[PDB]
Amino acid sequence: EKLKQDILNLRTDISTSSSSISSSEENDFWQPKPT
């Protein structure tokens, strides 16, 4: 994850998230993590 981010893009250095969608993800009603 080391690549020195935040230079001229201001947060989120090159993100695929733009116009992609599928099953509306699985996170949209409580995110229960392994306690």
UniProtKB/Swiss-Prot annotation:
Biological function: Precursor of the egg-yolk proteins that are sources of nutrients during embryonic development. Involved in the differentiation of honeybee larvae into queens.
Shown stretch of the complete protein: 358 to 392 of 1770
Coiled coil: none
Induction and repression of expression: By MRJP1 during the differentiation of honeybee larvae into queens.
Tissue expression pattern: Accumulates in the hemolymph. Represents up to 70% of the queen's hemolymph proteins. During the first week of the worker adult life, when it becomes a nurse bee and performs brood-rearing tasks, the vitellogenin titer increases and may account for up to 40% of the total hemolymph proteins.
The protein, known as: Vitellogenin
Cellular compartments annotated: Secreted
Span list, region Disordered: 16-35
Tree of life domain: Eukaryota
